[PDB]
Amino acid sequence: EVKKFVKIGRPGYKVTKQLFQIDYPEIAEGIMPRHRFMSAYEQRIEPPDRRWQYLLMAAEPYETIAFKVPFWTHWNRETKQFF
Amino acid sequence: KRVLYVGGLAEEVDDKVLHAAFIPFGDITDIQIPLDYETEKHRGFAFVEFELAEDAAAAIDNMNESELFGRTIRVNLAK
Amino acid sequence: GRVTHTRRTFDRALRALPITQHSRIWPLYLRFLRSHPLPETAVRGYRRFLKLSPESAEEYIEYLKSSDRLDEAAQRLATVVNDERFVSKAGKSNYQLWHELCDLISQNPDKVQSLNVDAIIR
Amino acid sequence: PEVRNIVDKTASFVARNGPEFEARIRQNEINNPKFNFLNPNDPYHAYYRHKVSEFKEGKAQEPSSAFDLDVVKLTAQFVARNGRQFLTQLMQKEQRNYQFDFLRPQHSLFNYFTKLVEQYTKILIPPKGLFSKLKKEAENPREVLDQVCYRVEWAKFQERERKKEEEEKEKERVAYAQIDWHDFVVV
Numbered sequence: 306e307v308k309k310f311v312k313i314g315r316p317g318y319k320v321t322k323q324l325f326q327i328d329y330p331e332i333a334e335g336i337m338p339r340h341r342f343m344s345a346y347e348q349r350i351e352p353p354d355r356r357w358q359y360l361l362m363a364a365e366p367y368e369t370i371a372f373k374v375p376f377w378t379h380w381n382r383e384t385k386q387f388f
Numbered sequence: 389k390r391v392l393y394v395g396g397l398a399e400e401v402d403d404k405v406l407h408a409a410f411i412p413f414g415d416i417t418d419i420q421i422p423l424d425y426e427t428e429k430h431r432g433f434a435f436v437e438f439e440l441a442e443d444a445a446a447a448i449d450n451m452n453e454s455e456l457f458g459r460t461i462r463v464n465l466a467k
Numbered sequence: 468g469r470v471t472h473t474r475r476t477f478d479r480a481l482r483a484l485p486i487t488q489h490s491r492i493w494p495l496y497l498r499f500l501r502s503h504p505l506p507e508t509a510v511r512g513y514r515r516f517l518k519l520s521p522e523s524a525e526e527y528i529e530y531l532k533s534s535d536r537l538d539e540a541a542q543r544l545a546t547v548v549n550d551e552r553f554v555s556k557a558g559k560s561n562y563q564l565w566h567e568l569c570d571l572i573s574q575n576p577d578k579v580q581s582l583n584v585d586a587i588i589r
Numbered sequence: 590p591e592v593r594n595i596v597d598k599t600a601s602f603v604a605r606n607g608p609e610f611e612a613r614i615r616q617n618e619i620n621n622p623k624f625n626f627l628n629p630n631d632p633y634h635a636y637y638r639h640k641v642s643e644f645k646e647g648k649a650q651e652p653s654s655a656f657d658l659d660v661v662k663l664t665a666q667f668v669a670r671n672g673r674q675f676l677t678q679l680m681q682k683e684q685r686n687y688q689f690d691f692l693r694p695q696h697s698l699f700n701y702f703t704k705l706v707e708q709y710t711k712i713l714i715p716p717k718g719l720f721s722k723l724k725k726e727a728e729n730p731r732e733v734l735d736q737v738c739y740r741v742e743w744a745k746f747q748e749r750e751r752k753k754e755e756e757e758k759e760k761e762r763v764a765y766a767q768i769d770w771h772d773f774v775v776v
Binding site: 409454455456457458 | 553554555556558559
């Protein structure tokens with residue numbers, strides 16, 4: 306059900322790298338937006354030559370801030386800033 | 389967890405360069421970079437072993453999304 | 468009081484090529500630049516065309532900017548601005564913005580001919 | 590901006606008092622083109638109408654080893670006589686020609702040193718036995734029952750807190766098995 310009601314609004318990610326800090330709208334949900342390193346081989350078209358990993362930090366209302374990479378975080382709900 | 393895994397070892401990236409630029413956050417005790425024996429160039433992966441977990445955590449946090457001679461490097465936590 | 472000790476001492480300390488003898492060779496040029504910019508320009512040019520480092524031109528130009536010879540400082544800056552194998556020599560550290568700062572301190576209210584200033588801005 | 594400020598004023602009024610205040614303004618000033626944007630007659634109508642909800646929700650802005658154990662106990666007894674973090678009975682004895690590698694903070698024996706120190710502090714404080722006697726413990730079934738129920742109550746609070754943490758971790762597991770792996774993108 307957590308995905309049977311998985312709404313796809315596709316909102317932009319506002320993330321600052323240089324250690325990454327992303328902002329998102331007010332969700333009002335205790336679930337912390339999670340990051341993870343995953344494979345660059347899956348897709349609906351998948352242009353060739355996918356041989357790097359991708360670190361994606363995604364949550365409920367704000368779309369996943371993903372970036373190719375060529376309790377180690379923080380989630381401020383009173384400011385809504387993720388690090 | 390006092391290890392920094394430096395992904396992105398550039399063309400002339402040596403353990404001296406890595407532990408020198410990431411030495412200021414804490415005493416780094418060892419360094420080891422996987423160098424392709426058939427290529428003489430590193431595999432884009434190095435390991436700096438400090439004694440301080442605060443040092444290595446601050447290093448992973450401030451040295452991620454890094455750059456050394458025009459190369460977008462990233463420091464992560466070794467397992 | 469004689470350049471003999473300076474030259475021979477530098478050569479004997481340079482027998483190995485470690486980070487030793489570096490801040491005795493280059494501050495020797497610093498203290499030699501007094502009342503004689505020729506040995507200063509000599510050490511600066513031969514160093515920028517001598518033993519390899521990205522900090523070589525750094526210390527050279529940072530020592531030359533403090534003297535009455537500053538186009539030589541800009542010459543070592545230009546050695547960096549070409550660099551022939553590393554466009555980014557220092558990562559986050561700046562050479563071009565610092566050159567712009569020196570150009571700003573030159574277009575400071577001294578050269579108000581209003582041509583050199585706009586040239587330095589471009 | 591006259592028309593913009595007026596539309597934002599109608600929006601703030603609708604946010605505070607409702608669209609019923611909008612209708613009140615409509616019937617009160619249908620004689621004036623100022624309630625024209627509160628009417629379907631002026632072009633600012635829909636803009637100010639959405640601006641009502643905007644200012645209501647806060648999207649717009651309003652207008653402008655026995656021996657080792659004994660030795661560790663002795664070290665704790667000497668650290669109960671320590672006056673500062675540097676000047677105590679262990680500093681010189683660290684380098685005074687005798688073996689003492691238990692002051693090092695990484696060796697697990699530093700935990701026994703610190704626990705001996707914590708007990709030494711809880712026994713060397715004023716009620717620990719220094720210059721006074723506590724008797725609500727030495728003759729007190731009332732205090733005994735109080736403190737025992739209180740330990741059980743802290744245990745119950747910690748049980749509920751661990752259950753909450755486990756439920757949150759379960760939600761995190763179900764959501765980690767439910768994060769999106771197709772519409773990925775780099776910004």
